[PDB]
Design an enzyme around this catalytic site. Structure first.
Site, short mmCIF file in Angstrom:
data_model
loop_
_atom_site.label_atom_id
_atom_site.label_comp_id
_atom_site.label_asym_id
_atom_site.label_seq_id
_atom_site.Cartn_x
_atom_site.Cartn_y
_atom_site.Cartn_z
N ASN A 1 -18.00 24.37 -6.01
CA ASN A 1 -18.53 24.94 -7.24
C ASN A 1 -17.78 24.30 -8.41
OD1 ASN A 1 -18.69 26.63 -9.64
ND2 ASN A 1 -19.77 28.14 -8.38
N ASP B 1 -18.37 24.52 -11.78
CA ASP B 1 -18.37 25.21 -13.08
C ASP B 1 -18.81 24.30 -14.22
OD1 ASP B 1 -17.95 27.61 -14.64
OD2 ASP B 1 -16.08 26.80 -15.42
N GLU C 1 -23.43 25.10 -9.26
CA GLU C 1 -23.29 25.42 -10.67
C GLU C 1 -23.07 24.15 -11.48
OE1 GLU C 1 -20.75 28.93 -11.18
OE2 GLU C 1 -20.55 28.33 -13.27
N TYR D 1 -26.22 27.91 -4.10
CA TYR D 1 -25.53 28.67 -5.13
C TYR D 1 -26.21 30.04 -5.22
CZ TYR D 1 -23.67 30.08 -9.63
OH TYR D 1 -23.07 30.77 -10.64
N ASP E 1 -21.43 28.16 -2.64
CA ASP E 1 -20.90 29.37 -3.25
C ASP E 1 -21.82 30.50 -2.85
OD1 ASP E 1 -20.05 31.42 -4.89
OD2 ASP E 1 -20.00 30.20 -6.70
N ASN F 1 -21.25 33.59 -3.19
CA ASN F 1 -21.01 34.74 -4.06
C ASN F 1 -20.76 36.06 -3.34
OD1 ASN F 1 -20.77 34.52 -6.94
ND2 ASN F 1 -22.79 33.54 -6.93
N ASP G 1 -16.66 30.53 -1.12
CA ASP G 1 -17.25 29.29 -0.64
C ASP G 1 -17.03 29.14 0.85
OD1 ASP G 1 -15.97 28.77 -3.57
OD2 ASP G 1 -17.95 27.84 -3.34
N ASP H 1 -13.01 26.56 -11.69
CA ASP H 1 -12.35 27.80 -11.27
C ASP H 1 -12.48 28.05 -9.75
OD1 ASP H 1 -15.01 28.34 -11.69
OD2 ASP H 1 -14.71 30.28 -12.68
N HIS H 2 -13.21 27.17 -9.07
CA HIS H 2 -13.22 27.13 -7.60
C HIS H 2 -12.50 25.87 -7.16
CE1 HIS H 2 -16.78 29.97 -6.79
NE2 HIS H 2 -16.69 29.90 -8.10
MN MN Z 1 -18.64 29.29 -13.23
#
Ligand code: MN
EC number: 3.1.11.2
Length: 281
Positions: free
Chosen positions: A31, A33, A59, A134, A173, A175, A246, A271-272
């Protein structure tokens, strides 16, 4: 808060299967971002050092018609497929970049309601089909949680379909942190996106129905503090206050080809962090 640093050191790459077969496929999922922010943050230089055979990105936030030109400095992953929200705007989006072209690439999960946000790419190869996803966040205030339950079901059925034809690898991801061991603070997140009982349950259903095995957790069933996302705020990464969102999930038939499932905790750019799968196919 309540948490201080919890150490985690990803074990060395195990690159041979339990039968002694060297890995022949390296898959990296990340991911990012934002494709453009990620690239600015040197995400690609890490990709080159990692040298995977397939790179799956989530993303990308990037219209399929506004791809960064830097994506042409990857001569090793020259086959590149992108899915972004059908409204042609800058959110969500996934990518799949491959050394070898797949036999076929498809987009979405064959469900119009769920196919408008560029969340899924299916790349069919000789011995297996690779899907990257995602998954819809349940939303601040859980306002998207009901949709997410709709999504979870459709997705679970669609995957079930694919697997009946070929061994499946699903990565991305997803989630959700499946179990308590999968995030630093289970107690305070049971009402937040990523750790509702609804989401945890759907991950569980996904595993048994298809069925799929959680590659990392199959190899490291009792290993805690292994995460792939940390909020940018509150200095979370530095305290390793994170979530495992993930995953690489495999058809059970692929488990004898599983060499290792890695979490590249030190790789910066989003941030991942990246995760990497070694298979001996
Ligand atoms: Mn993000």
């Amino acid at each position: 808060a309540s948490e201080g640093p919890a150490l985690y050191e990803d074990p060395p790459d195990q690159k041979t299967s339990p039968s002694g077969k060297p890995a022949t496929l390296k898959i990296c999922s990340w991911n990012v971002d934002g494709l453009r922010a990620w690239i600015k943050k040197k995400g690609l230089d890490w990709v080159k050092e990692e040298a995977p055979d397939i790179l799956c990105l989530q993303e990308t936030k990037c219209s399929e018609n506004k791809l960064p030109a830097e994506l042409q400095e990857l001569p090793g992953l020259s086959h590149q497929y992108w899915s972004a929200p059908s409204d042609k705007e800058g959110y969500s989006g996934v990518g799949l970049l491959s050394r070898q072209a797949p036999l076929k690439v498809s987009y979405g999960i064959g469900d119009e309601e769920h196919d408008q946000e560029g969340r899924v790419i299916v790349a069919e190869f000789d011995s297996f089909v690779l899907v990257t996803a995602y998954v819809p966040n349940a939303g601040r205030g859980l306002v998207r949680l009901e949709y997410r339950q709709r999504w979870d079901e459709a997705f679970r059925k669609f995957l079930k379909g694919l697997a009946s034809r070929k061994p499946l690898v699903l990565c991305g991801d997803l989630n959700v942190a499946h179990e308590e061991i999968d995030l630093r603070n289970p107690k305070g997140n049971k009402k937040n996106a990523g750790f509702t009982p609804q989401e945890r349950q759907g991950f569980g259903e996904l595993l048994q129905a298809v069925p799929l095995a959680d590659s990392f957790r199959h190899l490291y069933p009792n290993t805690p503090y292994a995460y792939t996302f940390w909020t940018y705020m509150m200095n979370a990464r530095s305290k390793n206050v994170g979530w495992r969102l993930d995953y690489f999930l495999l058809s059970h038939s692929l488990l004898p080809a599983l060499c290792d499932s890695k979490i590249r905790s030190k790789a910066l750019g989003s941030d991942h962090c990246p995760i990497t799968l070694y298979l001996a196919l």
